[PDB]
Design a protein around this ligand. Structure first.
Ligand code: HEM
Ligand code: HEM
Ligand SMILES: Cc1cc(N)nc(CCc2cc(CCCN(C)C)c(F)c(F)c2F)c1
Ligand SMILES: Cc1cc(N)nc(CCc2cc(CCCN(C)C)c(F)c(F)c2F)c1
Ligand SMILES: C[C@H](O)[C@H](O)[C@H]1CNc2nc(N)[nH]c(=O)c2N1
Ligand SMILES: C[C@H](O)[C@H](O)[C@H]1CNc2nc(N)[nH]c(=O)c2N1
Ligand SMILES: [Zn+2]
Lengths: 410, 411
């Protein structure tokens, strides 16, 4: 019941007691482990108050006022407000705490050593999609900071009856369009083909290019979503060149500086925030391994290996592995040259081990999903590969939610 | 009930029903996943259900479930259990059991080959000298002059737990490690403790960087005994690089035959505590783990030095670059010497084909994503994108304690 995790490279053993405060479920049973499943998964008055109490208990404990004057009053006041209104409103301090701890609790996030330095933008007074656009532009500008990226989240009004949902329809604030070609292939980002169509097949004027920044599709108060173009001067992009291969720049590659997830649901004290875009900065492998070299994405491995003149006859020449490394050197080199914040996988995974040690010491544990924390290249030469991790679900949390074009009462 | 797994690269969705036949536990609960944890004395009370379950599976596989032969064998095993408190497997049952323990090994990416296992029945063995002879014959057969063949040798099953057969080596062929007084290590740091035991048991160590360890073999619960594998039976491969002529001067070599010897084979409730098995290497086992783990031979520095990469900042990816070149050299060396090896691209593709076939013909394939995904180039192999369900089926291979921690020395 008091569990231990071992690092097999260093023999360091940590003792986890935090998991005993886990609330939600993992998808696993003692008969079957679902650790590699990508997606392992109204609201009444009964359910809401224990959730608020659990959250307020940990909030007042965190400020060393558990069982105090203000603690009992706040508990009473929220209880009064739920009994009356069937919901409640977070104090600004509780919202900031809840958002920072949702990130602290994100077991798939390797960047959590930064969790306490998060800029929380309270957008709970927003009422229209034009107001949403305004808040998102300000977020993008703040977070981008001319390349000196700063972590931020913008929190739109919480769900009420499920009919008045605020939703950002984009999966990330900044992504590249994808169109299926006449000759059967795909131009741009294949992952965004259905979305790039919903933008066109409902308003947008696509420049049908390969790296077209998609428009925002914003939904306020349950209404139909509206299209907005992010001002291009707010979208920091990096042309990708290689520090050795001069032909690399001729590949035509670029990527955007700001990774900003916008389709997750933020849960704090039972309250659900369905529009809560958040951003940090890239780990190099997200772009160079996944975005560029996945077969279902831009899938550039063949072209790069050909220009390197590698033996592509046999897989055992490891031509894919060689090109992969060069592509990721170029991504890192390009961002660093343009003074755009980026972290390589060696530095980020080292940071996470230090974060884990901090969390075990000051908190008694750190939920972590090994399948997601280990980078998608060079796994075993990073320290996290050799680190046993316990995965469990703590709240406040970021959760997945259905894509809105499958749920919108249109 | 049914369970579905999806491949996010190809959108193929498979449906698992085999997990219903799972019995052992995973370590996980509804509230915690132990998927990345490395490691999550038997009476007649529990033995006959285990035997009956196994014999049901065996007679089903041969299309004889419920036949007179099936019923007579159950009756015969039942009587032998209450008469003798254990039972003996037929040769055919042992072969089926060993093949299916491999088929059920959720951490093994090489399972497309499970039905072509050569099973050596060594249940008549009585002494450590006899174990040595069986293991020599296994090594010669499996090596096959570089054309490797999968094999397993099965020594007598556990009785009261005081008479165990054990191979004290973790693998039949491994290099020694020696801790120096200055704190540095010569050879394989993974094997320092076992090397100390061998030395204490009388082994005369050459004290080089690639000394093949002696076999330390325990029969019938007696103290273990040292034996040197005849060197002409240990096939080794000097490592060189197809383009880098200085790579040979690093002085690296490795052995051809990977042969695990510390696991326990469970078949029908019977426990075979000495069951060495062997296949052939996937290149990354040597080039990534054996050579580049910080806690193993740890050659990333010197390789990158000789390559003259920028080693001052990690963001040059000098480690990633040297890692690839080393793994090219491993594959090139084995192929050039005509010693069986498989690269991680081929092995993971074969495993995906295996897994799909197992879903079609068997209703599932238990698989441990954490171990199946190779330790370099993860997402450019197809297993990275493949959802997998992990569960425990029997027959199975299990971990067991290191014998020096449990053995009662006879002196
Ligand atoms: C500041 C630097 C950050 C870095 C380097 C970083 C790194 C990463 C990486 C590499 C992933 C895996 C995502 C993937 O492979 O698709 C991830 C996931 C995630 N990150 Fe972080 N992140 C950062 C900031 C943040 C922030 C500011 C938040 C929230 C406030 C956050 C919340 C999450 C969540 C919830 C996931 C899981 C996404 C999912 O389950 O699909 N991250 N992060
Ligand atoms: C024929 C070629 C084979 C290949 C390419 C192969 C590949 C692998 C690899 C790469 C691993 C992970 C090992 C590690 O990272 O330390 C593994 C694990 C394993 N293999 Fe296979 N294997 C083969 C044959 C066999 C055979 C013949 C058996 C048994 C009869 C077997 C049973 C297992 C088991 C039980 C594990 C789990 C090891 C553990 O939990 O430590 N494999 N295999
Ligand atoms: C703040 C942040 C920093 C960073 N460095 N990286 C990311 C990227 C996280 C991510 C999250 C998701 C899940 C939500 C999307 N939908 C499909 C549910 C992805 F899908 C995805 F591709 C993806 F990159 C975010
Ligand atoms: C037949 C086979 C083919 C192949 N291609 N590869 C292997 C290697 C499996 C392996 C298994 C273990 C299990 C014992 C665990 N104990 C020592 C903690 C190892 F340790 C180890 F190093 C190791 F390589 C085996
Ligand atoms: C099937 C498997 O769970 C899936 O491919 C996961 C593996 N690990 C991952 N890890 C990260 N960081 N991001 C991902 O998208 C994935 N995909
Ligand atoms: C902590 C973690 O479970 C451990 O390092 C695992 C990760 N996956 C692995 N996968 C393989 N094939 N072999 C290993 O030794 C390991 N080690
Ligand atoms: Zn699990």
């Amino acid at each position: 019941r008091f569990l231990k995790v071992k690092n097999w490279e260093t023999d360091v053993v940590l003792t986890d007691t935090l998991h005993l405060k886990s609330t939600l479920e993992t998808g696993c049973t003692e008969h079957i482990c679902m650790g590699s499943i990508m997606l392992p998964s109204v609201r009444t008055k009964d359910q809401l108050f224990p959730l608020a109490k659990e959250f307020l208990d940990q909030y007042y404990s965190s400020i060393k006022r558990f069982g105090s004057k203000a603690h009992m009053d706040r508990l009473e006041e929220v209880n009064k407000e739920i009994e009356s209104t069937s919901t409640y409103q977070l104090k600004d301090t509780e919202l900031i705490y809840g958002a920072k701890h949702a990130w602290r609790n994100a077991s798939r996030c390797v960047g959590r050593i930064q969790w306490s330095k998060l800029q929380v933008f309270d957008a709970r007074d927003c009422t229209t999609a034009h107001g949403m656009f305004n808040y998102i532009c300000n977020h993008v500008k703040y977070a981008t900071n001319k390349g000196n990226l700063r972590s931020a989240i913008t929190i739109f009004p919480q769900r009420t009856d499920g009919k008045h949902d605020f939703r950002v329809w984009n999966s990330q604030l900044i992504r590249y369009a994808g169109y299926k070609q006449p000759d059967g292939s795909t131009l741009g980002d294949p992952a965004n083909v259905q979305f790039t169509e919903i933008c066109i097949q409902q308003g947008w004027k696509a420049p049908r290019g390969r790296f077209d920044v998609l428009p925002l599709l914003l939904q306020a108060n349950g209404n139909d979503p509206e299209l907005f173009q992010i001002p291009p001067e707010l979208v920091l992009e990096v042309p990708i060149r290689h520090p050795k291969f001069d032909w690399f720049k001729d590949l035509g590659l670029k990527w955007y500086g700001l990774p900003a997830v916008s389709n997750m649901l933020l849960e704090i004290g039972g309250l659900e925030f369905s529009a809560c875009p958040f951003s940090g900065w890239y780990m190099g492998t997200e772009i160079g391994v996944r975005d560029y070299c996945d077969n279902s994405r831009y899938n550039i491995l063949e072209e790069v290996a050909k220009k390197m003149d590698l033996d592509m006859r046999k897989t055992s020449s490891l031509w894919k592995d060689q090109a992969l490394v060069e592509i990721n050197i170029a991504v890192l080199y390009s961002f660093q040259s343009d003074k755009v914040t980026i972290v390589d996988h060696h530095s980020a995974t080292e940071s996470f081990i230090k974060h884990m040690e901090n969390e075990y010491r000051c908190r008694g544990g750190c939920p972590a999903d090994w399948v997601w924390i280990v980078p998608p290249m060079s796994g075993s030469i990073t320290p996290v590969f050799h680190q046993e991790m316990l995965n469990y679900r703590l709240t406040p949390s970021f959760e997945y939610q259905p894509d809105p074009w499958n749920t919108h009462v249109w």
